[model samples]
Target: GQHYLNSDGSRFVPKDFYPKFSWDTTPMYYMFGDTTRLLEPEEVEFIAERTDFLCIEKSHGRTPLGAAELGAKHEAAAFKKIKPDMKVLFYFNSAYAWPFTSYNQAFTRNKIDEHPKLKSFLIVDPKTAELAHRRNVFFFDVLNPELREWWSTTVAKGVAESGCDGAFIDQMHGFAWLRADKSEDVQKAMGEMMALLKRKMGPDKILLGNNANQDIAKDAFPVMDASMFEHYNEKLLSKESLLQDWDDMLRIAQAGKMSIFRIGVESDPRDQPVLAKERAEYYLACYLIGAQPYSYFQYGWGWTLSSGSLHEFPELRKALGPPKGAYDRTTPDGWEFTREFEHASVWVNTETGNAKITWR
Candidate 1:
């Protein structure tokens, strides 16, 4: 249920959590280059059976139609074979107005020359504009209110057009450092942009913010459905570290009146990746904290069938094999849960009754 601030400086209770349970809908490979192999039906079933929510990487420029089709297929397959109550989501690139162009290119090409520092903004890619134009969509310009409105409308339309339960707003953070003038300006711009999306999509839409800072979420909590703290350094991917992060996120959510989502990458045992036992430990810590876990697929282009290196890691599968309902299961500790993400072996704490965590 969404929380509201009362005049007495207390939290107001709502009838229901607007978005319900936290969902783990990470991109398979397109976003991470993990497409070296197409997942077999069994693999897809494995994910669908375990996850309450799923998301495919469908950028406005690359394989937009394919991404949509994938989402449709996943939804249909999950419902037909797995949990009927499951929700499916889609992650669309909304911020990087320029694409194909690297961060450096976007910095060099000052199409929006008003903000001289715009060039140094890391998320922009020149190709982003090209892609948006190609798809008849507009890339979100955090600096421009009109552009933000257009971006929100486009997102709402995409949701309506694709029939997805929600959308993942990637790279929504980091603009604070990119703004030419002030961090406050960047935060305000982002808040306005998110508010427009919320107004357009309403409460039913799932809005997931990636790599966004706590300050932004604190302001956007009223409008945002969930905030994802992504790309925590590998050192922080440990069991102790994750538990601490989960706690911090929950507190933030509670304080901000929004649900919190965390994301990270764990080491894979295949290429001498993180040890099997370590990975298991990481998952356990996250699960105990009521955070949804996600795995990134960073292989290659297109869908192919190749286990590549870590195909033999049964423990890895088992570690990820929590029941679909596990996310909603309550702990004796009475701590509510949220979502989590990772890419490698970070640190997380799960010591019962302990409130603090440290990362290497």
Candidate 2:
């Protein structure tokens, strides 16, 4: 369950409150290898106790049919034993599977229903028409209403059949800043898809848009439940930069609208082998800005837990703060900004009392 706090630093009334805090439960990006590798009840308890909601990545490609069966079984077992009372979300990436001829074969409703606590599924937009076209990837322009409607229908069927609670839509930012010939179509298609999902899924299911371009999100804000902004700066393996990425999200929320969640590719095992202190501060900043913290654990790197308890770095835990609470204030200053992506910047906002920050 999520908690809501007012701007005055007091708990908001139940009816007026909106949920906050979502935990990415997978082990830093890699999916569970087998049932034997699943976390024990006590381990699940440890994680569930600290986060508001838990999310599991069910499939890396399209479906969880063959080799991935272990992931589904273990996650289901873990969720059933751990935080049965808390909300659970399941995620899947379509873009990652699009390149293969077996796209549809990879995903199936049967696998999804096998998990008891599986609540929601996230769909990352197609990065390229065919995985073979990886070098020159193109976003699915939103202007195609027909395409959007088709997507809506496909998702609706997937949710209904799988018994999923909701949908997490990703990659809207990749389509931003398109040429005149394609921009309107893309925006229109995206808006329609958002509306259709809300209408089809009904009010109970959650709708999350990921790493979306701020400008496009503004127009779609009215209908969306939350917007995910990825790659913010913090004091992890490196010093905190001074760029404020949450500024626009704050501006949008201040206008009495959609919620925002912040995520990042911090779990890249190839970079800095598990710097717990930095991970902790990263999550802390997300909490302060009324955003949920999330990460991507890339698989190719062999970083899975191979021993005694997967030791949660104590320093990371210390920086995270109590679960189900909100920040009293957030000052973003004293950090630098980086232009790693379009409409992206990283740095600290001393005015907001932040030591480092990043935005895209």
Candidate 3:
């Protein structure tokens, strides 16, 4: 009923060996592209009142309205009054890419002019020979130790001045490809970068990273208070992928760090995409796997969903409290599994793109 979260919004423990958490959940997320317009006021309020952590990403020079209200620290404002503990994070890439001209000011700050060493680290585009771009995209090199320190310091400073709790490190998993030679140095450097940031940000601060793959998750998590799984396995939402993701969540949960999962859907269903029943199913799946929802949607432009409402259903929530059991792989596309709890039970079907909440 009080102070359920640490100041940084990570689950807080009153003392040793205490593993209980409240009905409250920490659903984290953000949007990075055009984001040309602001979210509706209702959406902003929805997020402010419910989300535990979020990064107000730089969107083509503009920030989300939700970010503004939450980060602004306007004392007289309702945001602070309602959810005083929401942690706001500034988002930026360490290396591997930047949207030039779009975020020109930020690019200039991270350019080779300021840090000459970054130039050599920049991967040469197989086509352009200057910048690494697939089409209109560009990337930065991260093999240098200085860049890691620079990034850490930059994030620390950003959070310090803006009154934000912390910063989100994007693309931590993407830079391993830059180790064209595939040496252990890249992994070591990545580990060092995150470790340095965690220290600079101090013990009480929040440090979350986008560990897009398993290798980075293994290396980068030592310094992270939490980690995000972005663009989750929609392509292979089958037995193997579900188990793999569950393994990732397990690592975070077992370590006492938080887990935020974002299932970014590129292919949108024209009509009602997430029905009420379907939403309940996804939220239940997260609970069973010891993960929190960071799932975002671009229903029209973009959206971030929450599991806060699920708390109202005490019976169902309690049902998922027990350890998740084995899977039922008899289904065609994927599999299903059920976990029995004190009050109720749930069967999470991982059949990709399956809308019907086939209950047993």
Candidate 4:
């Protein structure tokens, strides 16, 4: 039995809002993104056909605040029309006060410009007595109780108004930016803020946090519905770290939380309509090595809306069945691992970044 959320803190068991998949058949478990531009009919159709999970990022609407939210509203509505069950998440940063969407206008424009009390909500340098910021990007003093209340309530309202299922909270990893002594208390406050958000969003809506794979951010799991790895390159592909990721995915699944393992690739966006065959297979094989039920894979270069959406991997569409068991160390050297699926076999050499998935 799976536990779902009610608006109150009570738990209710219900059918999954998202479609269920089985290992007996091909499991096309993938997540997609959009640039915020209204999608073409064909693009929507393609998205409907491929996956049911999407994150509508900032910079979606060219307009400011109110107009921007209206843009996201329509876009989210369009996706739902094609596939009513699609779970679309609205994007906002968790630690950085990025004035990207209408949802942030209250803090970014109104409060900052008119009242100017937002200064109290910003992180301050104990030594310099100046506000902590980088490259014009301001930080949220999540340690402030008033700021947390305002943030959680406002974001919940935005998600509800925008017709999205939940929030895609980014930069959660930024907790590391705080002073060594402040990290613990700030992280604790962040957890409290996330709890407030969960309560405000109700039990049914999602609160997806990014970079939970980082040790510092693991505390966010209890409050959020899902977590994203946001893997940038082969930096985390070493056997030890790869196993760590695999085990992490297992625990996330066991806890009934969604795991979005996004593997980055290096490719030119201009080369459209088809992904270069070079890195696609290896990265996918690595993902298959650790993917668990409710786990979705994202393969692309950058996070922005890209031509990558138009490209498809034949293997993803192929019959993947379920993993036979946890991956095995195929060689004594511990550089290679293999796992069997009902319809496919996966093998990878973590040291060389080489892998193959054999299909029946």
Best by TM-score: 4
Candidate 1, residues 1-360: lDDT per residue as tens digits?
A: 133332223453422323233222222222221222234467556655444554544422233323343444444344446555455555555565533212212322334344454433323445553322324322455766666666677677666655666666776552455455666776777778778887787556667666443555454555665555453455454445555555555454454433333332333212213343334344434533443223222221122122222233232233222222223223555443332222222223333322211111
RMSD of each: 10.3, 10.3, 6.9, 5.2
Per residue, candidate 4 scores C-alpha lDDT tens digits across 244-320 of: 88878777776767678776565322242344446667777877777776667776666555636656667667787
Residue 3, candidate 2: Cα error in Å is 9.2
Candidate 3 per-residue C-alpha lDDT over 1-360 given as tens digits, one digit per residue, 9 for 90 to 100: 243332124443332211223433223343332234444446557555444445555442244433322233221133345566655565657664453212223334345456455455456666656656555344555565666776677667656655666666776654565455654666667778778887887656777777634575467778777676553444434546666766666555556666556543332231223443335455445334334222221111133223222123222323222222323334555466554332334466555433222222
lDDT of 4: 0.68
Q: Write the per-residue lDDT of candidate 2 for residues 216-325, one digit (tens) a residue.
A: 55445556655544444343213322123345444434443343333333432324335444544344343343332332221221223321124453422332222233
Provide TM-scores for the models: 0.56, 0.57, 0.68, 0.86
Stretch of 10 with least lDDT, candidate 4: 1-10
Ranking by TM-score: 4, 3, 2, 1
Write down the TM-score for model 2: 0.57
lDDT of each: 0.43, 0.39, 0.48, 0.68
Model 3 alpha-carbon drift over 4 Å, by segment: 1-21, 24-42, 60-78, 97-121, 126-129, 134-137, 267-334, 341-344, 351-360
Model 1 CA RMSD to the hidden true structure, in angstroms? 10.3
Better-scoring candidate (lDDT), 1 or 3? 3
Stretches > 4 Å off in candidate 4 = 1-15, 22-36, 63-68, 106-113, 125-128, 267-276
How many clashes (backbone N, Cα, C below 3 Å) per candidate? 48, 40, 0, 0
Which residues of candidate 1, in runs, are more than 4 Å off? Answer: 1-40, 59-82, 98-140, 235-244, 252-263, 266-277, 286-360
In model 2, which regions exceed 4 Å deviation? Answer: 1-4, 8-46, 58-64, 67-81, 92-103, 106-132, 135-141, 174-180, 232-244, 252-274, 282-360
